[PDB]
Amino acid sequence: MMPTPVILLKEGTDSSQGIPQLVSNISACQVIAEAVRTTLGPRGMDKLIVDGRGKATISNDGATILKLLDVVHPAAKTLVDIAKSQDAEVGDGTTSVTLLAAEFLKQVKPYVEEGLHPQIIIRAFRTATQLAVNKIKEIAVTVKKADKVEQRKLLEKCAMTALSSKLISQQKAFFAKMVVDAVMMLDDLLQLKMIGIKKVQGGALEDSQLVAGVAFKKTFSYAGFEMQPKKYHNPKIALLNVELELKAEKDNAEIRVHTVEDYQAIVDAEWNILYDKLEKIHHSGAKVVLSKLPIGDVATQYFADRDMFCAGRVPEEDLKRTMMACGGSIQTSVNALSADVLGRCQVFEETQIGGERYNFFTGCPKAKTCTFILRGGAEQFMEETERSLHDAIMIVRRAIKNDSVVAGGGAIEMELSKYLRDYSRTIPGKQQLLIGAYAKALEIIPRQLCDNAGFDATNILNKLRARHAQGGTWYGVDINNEDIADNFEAFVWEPAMVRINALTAASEAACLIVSVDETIKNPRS
């Protein structure tokens, strides 16, 4: 490198090329995998990350941990990206994707070091991934009976398997029943915004409840609110988007009068406008009034005088959930408050929950929504409970869409590894080594489960390999019994699409990382 009088690229440009930079990329991916390695399976542990502002986040979700880690390595960001993609498409497996991708790269690292062409490795990965996905689709167990009880039991088993790695795993049956009940309420789109999740500090985990309706926090009551009754036994609910306050008619409206009589008439006209809106609301028969826009003290006292309930500043999501639970319509005008635009609920009540007041709409038979109320001893406790419930909800939704399951605990990975090894033993031999490396890398999941559980991974892996070789598709790691067991009979069930997406994303990330031969870093602006 003789210094030219005029340099080509901008001064400070860092360029890395050849085998060493690809080896470094593989090492960076290994580091990223190790960052979430110990968060796998029922014996996995949690991670605590503190930001610059000092707030701590405690989580077991791989995607959350990777997002919180401020990864700047260009090759290492691929693992975070595929974890986010797995979270988006499936919602579970965000740790398995990173472990599998890094293990693929680690397995092909020795061949990379000896100058093997990356295109051969990419082709081998693509072939192995296609074969594995086809095998998963072929051997996945499906129940073609359309039995409600069996389908619900499948949902509950999948939810329990998804939840049996988090801090709420002790109450996993309870929370899985709650989640299955919650998802089956949604009609056809299974929108996440139709499942409210409220976290109230204080209380045990078992105190968490799923209200078959809508519940939301009290919203800045005005004077005279305490005079309103706090329980109704068959109320009609007036869902409104209306500001019930004494205010200017319009921001650009100016009143010009030249008589005191007209002044008094204008004052009385403003009062009469407000009272006409209130009378239109009251004569509709509604006893509970909810609004997005503020409800003033005058309206609060007016409704208290009529033994009605009012709540202003209700958030958009809460009002939409109330509409979907009760069966009304959010009205921006009170001129036509017909009987078909008013919600109906069996019981409305305001109760005390852990130092906060909540409004409950229960007994809604036609409800297409529900609200989770989570009780815990800490903010991060409730946040991680919400994350675990989100994982379970996504799993249950995917199970609704496609009810194909495979046994977890590394059983599917071991079966795929055996199949891929058997296939690779019947090809010329340049691709045989790489497909065998892929099959061996597929063993990272049961080995990591055993390592986290404190087992001896070598003996368990040997027993699993021997069992799969001689027959038995669904034999995996038994955490409690320190041994192996038929995970299908043990109800360790996960949807097949979870593993399909995991393998696809891991293979794509590995191929993308391998395909790069040069990294160029322009100087920071």
Binding site: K84, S85, Q86, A88, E89, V90, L189, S329, N501, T504, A505, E508
Partner: protein, 49 residues
């Protein structure tokens, strides 16, 4: 016209899941309560509603 070919990128399912749609896809939601129409009769306004 090259412009008449639009590309919408959505994460999650690998490039083998890509498809061609005869129409347009916009990454947004609907303002109102109706979310599905079977015999659309779209009226387009440049002015605010």
């Amino acid at each position: 016209n090259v412009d008449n070919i639009r590309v919408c990128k959505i994460l999650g399912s690998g490039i083998s899941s890509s498809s061609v749609l005869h129409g347009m896809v916009f990454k947004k939601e609907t303002e109102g309560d109706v979310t599905s129409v079977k015999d659309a009769k779209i009226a387009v306004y440049s002015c605010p509603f």
